[PDB]
């Protein structure tokens, strides 16, 4: 379905001037995860609240969960729901600081249970060679591509360094899902210039969009600086 990148269209690390551990920290160990809960309020009419307790670190006792729309928010409000998403702090504020916040990754729980968990195997491409491959698992029926592409960087931070405190070694990156007939991408770089806004680059998760888990499959695509 979505059509590839162009030429020049995905973002170029040398072209950030930032620092690229503001990108890194959101696919780091730490996220927002909640099983079979509901949302016990709601700030604007496109979002949720959730008192998810952060039983890690202690930094926030609810989250902020915001949709692209207020249909999804009057779709989740009263279901009782899975959460899981790359959350983030600076500026997070809200009427309902201990807050945090993040962009869809709602799944109504009920039904959507597996048994067993599944895997799904990434296939990474450098300068358009597939030299690793691996796999992300799930135990969801309907998975958020939020959640997926979490799972996906998350390992290629650890294993390939894909974001550093200062560089990535990568010039490119775009994770790419694919479910049979529906393929969809985004750019895993920074805009250009020398800031980093996680809040505005997290938004893209907005639209809550899942995959199946059974017939999804994942491409990274990456390019080095050579």
Not at 58 to 75: I, M, Q, S, T
Not at 194 to 215: G, I, R
Request: net charge neutral; aromatic share 16%.
């Amino acid at each position: 379905s979505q059509p590839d990148p162009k030429p020049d269209e995905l973002h170029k690390s040398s072209k950030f001037t930032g620092l690229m551990e503001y990108m890194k920290v959101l696919y780091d160990d730490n996220h927002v995860s909640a099983i079979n809960v509901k949302s016990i309020d709601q700030f604007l009419y496109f979002d949720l609240i959730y008192s998810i307790k952060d039983t890690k670190l202690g930094n926030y006792d609810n989250v902020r969960v915001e949709f692209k729309n207020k249909d999804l928010a009057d779709k989740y409000k009263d279901k009782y729901v899975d959460v899981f998403g790359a959350n983030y702090y600076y500026q997070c504020y809200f009427s309902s600081k201990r807050k945090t916040c993040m962009y869809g990754g709602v799944t109504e729980h009920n039904g959507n249970q597996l048994d067993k968990y599944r895997s799904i195997t990434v296939r990474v491409f450098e300068d358009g060679k597939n030299l690793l491959s691996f796999d992300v698992q799930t135990n969801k029926k309907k998975v958020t591509a939020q959640e997926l592409d979490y799972l996906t960087r998350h390992y290629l931070v650890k294993n390939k360094k894909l974001y550093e405190f200062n560089n990535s070694p990568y010039e490119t990156g775009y994770i790419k899902f694919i479910e049979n007939e529906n393929s969809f991408w985004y750019d895993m770089m920074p805009a250009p210039g020398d800031k980093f806004d996680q809040s505005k680059y997290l938004m893209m998760y907005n639209d809550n969009k899942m995959v199946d888990s059974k017939d999804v499959k994942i491409e990274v695509y990456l390019t080095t600086k050579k």
